[PDB]
Design a protein around this ligand. Structure first.
Ligand SMILES: *[C@@H]1O[C@H](CO)[C@@H](O)[C@H](O)[C@H]1NC(C)=O
Lengths: 50, 153, 55
């Protein structure tokens, strides 16, 4: 599980930084997330090489 | 003395429903069902989870009915999980609790008021039979219930 | 100036209390991602399903 979680967290960090370059960055409150499908599709196009 | 839960979210004639709640003839079987009506909002699913948790913990709910006024299929989609994970069955009659999703779980006990995809296809073909229009075409998107409709037609 | 705040929870033998607790806590923290990483479950069901449906 060590290297597995390491790779998952690296992927998450790169995807979050990639998304931070975009506009209309809302946040989940405490209605649906209007960037829900947007964020999901951003994560779907997540390609990496490391 | 079964416990029945009625949950209303959105504008509705709650007083009329309560007056018409005891409009059935159930005197021929010893049931004396207990019905509690409670109003709710469309804030988030977790609020619904908390409300149903409190209702079943307090009144020992053996049946849940949800009625709303939204246009989102997610209501029944998540209600399926509760119906499968709880021995108490759940029913949907109006609003967001009416659109039929792909399918229910094997352990699911949730039912809806409406026709299937194939029955709607049959009615639509009956319409095309009524007025003699025999040339047509079909286009659809990747919603899950597309293969069923195409194969039925 | 982007910051990464961490939130973790442990196991409980039940699957409704775990579900509601995780949902409410990670909703209040306003997180973006959720992970499930436990192979040796004594339960043979292997169910992260409440987490998935709630999130
Ligand atoms: C991090 O999350 C914890 C637990 O939800 C919260 O108490 C704290 O305020 C958060 N801190 C930051 C910097 O967001």
């Amino acid at each position: 599980e060590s290297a597995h979680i390491s790779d998952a967290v690296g992927v998450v960090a790169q995807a979050v930084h990639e998304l931070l370059e975009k506009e209309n960055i809302t946040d989940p409150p405490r209605n649906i997330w209007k960037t829900g499908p947007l964020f999901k599709r951003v994560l779907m196009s997540s390609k990496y090489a490391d | 003395s079964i416990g029945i839960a009625v949950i209303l979210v959105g504008t509705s004639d709650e007083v009329a429903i309560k007056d018409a709640h005891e409009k059935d003839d159930f005197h021929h079987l010893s049931v004396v069902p207990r019905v509690e009506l409670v109003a709710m909002n469309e804030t988030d699913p977790k609020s619904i989870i908390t409300r149903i948790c409190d209702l079943m913990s307090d009144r020992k709910i053996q049946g849940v009915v949800l009625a709303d006024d939204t246009d989102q299929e997610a209501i029944a989609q998540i209600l399926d999980f509760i119906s499968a994970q709880t021995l108490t069955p759940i029913l949907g009659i109006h609003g967001g609790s009416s659109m039929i999703m792909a399918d229910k779980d094997e352990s699911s006990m949730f039912f809806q008021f409406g026709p299937s995809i194939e029955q709607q296809a049959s009615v639509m073909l009956n319409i095309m039979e009524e007025y003699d229009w025999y040339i047509f075409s079909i286009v659809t998107t990747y919603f899950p219930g597309y293969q069923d409709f195409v194969n039925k037609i | 100036k982007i910051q990464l705040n961490a939130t973790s929870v442990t196991h409980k033998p039940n699957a409704i209390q775990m579900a509601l607790s995780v949902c409410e806590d990670l909703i209040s923290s306003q997180v973006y991602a959720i992970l499930v990483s436990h192979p040796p479950t004594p339960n043979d069901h292997f169910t992260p399903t409440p987490v998935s449906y709630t999130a």
